[PDB]
Amino acid sequence: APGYENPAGEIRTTVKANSSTGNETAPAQVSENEAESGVTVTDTISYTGLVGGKTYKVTGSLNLVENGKAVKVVVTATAELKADESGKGSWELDFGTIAGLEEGKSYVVYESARSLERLIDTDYDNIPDTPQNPVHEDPKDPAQTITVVP
Ligand SMILES: [Mg+2]
Numbered sequence: 001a002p003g004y005e006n007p008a009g010e011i012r013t014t015v016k017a018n019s020s021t022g023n024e025t026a027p028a029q030v031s032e033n034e035a036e037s038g039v040t041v042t043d044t045i046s047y048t049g050l051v052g053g054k055t056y057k058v059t060g061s062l063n064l065v066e067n068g069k070a071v072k073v074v075v076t077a078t079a080e081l082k083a084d085e086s087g088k089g090s091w092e093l094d095f096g097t098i099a100g101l102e103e104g105k106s107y108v109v110y111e112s113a114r115s116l117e118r119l120i121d122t123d124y125d126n127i128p129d130t131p132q133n134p135v136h137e138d139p140k141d142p143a144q145t146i147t148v149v150p
Contacts, residue, residue, distance in 0.1 A: 007049055007051050011134045012046045014044040028147070030148055039146070042095065043109045045092075045113065054132075058111060058113050062095060070110070114133040118130055119132040
């Protein structure tokens with residue numbers, strides 16, 4: 001086949017819980033009363049180095065964090081999303097309305113964006129043979145974290 005330069009992708013994530021958004025410094029926060037009432041959780045996935053116009057199966061997980069480690073999947077969400085023509089842009093993944101988040105606990109979002117098509121050449125025959133799949137799985141990323149406060 002002709003010249004095939006492998007795409008090299010990166011995804012970053014920002015969680016929103018009700019009206020609170022995580023950032024580089026501090027997690028999103030919801031009160032115990034908000035947690036009892038059901039928390040709307042959405043995650044923004046900022047991507048670069050994807051293949052323009054290609055569809056990615058995005059899977060997200062909301063994870064209980066203890067001692068800086070993800071110890072329990074609370075909920076997952078999934079959608080098939082198209083990369084912008086430039087291969088850079090953002091997606092929104094809607095987790096819906098989450099019950100049972102506990103006061104004093106932190107929860108972290110992970111994202112996996114896996115192309116439907118084979119876009120990575122693993123064997124240098126110039127033929128792509130495996131999906132492109134950047135991930136963001138940082139249990140200590142405050143931008144992906146929700147903390148329940150009194
Ligand atoms: Mg190949």
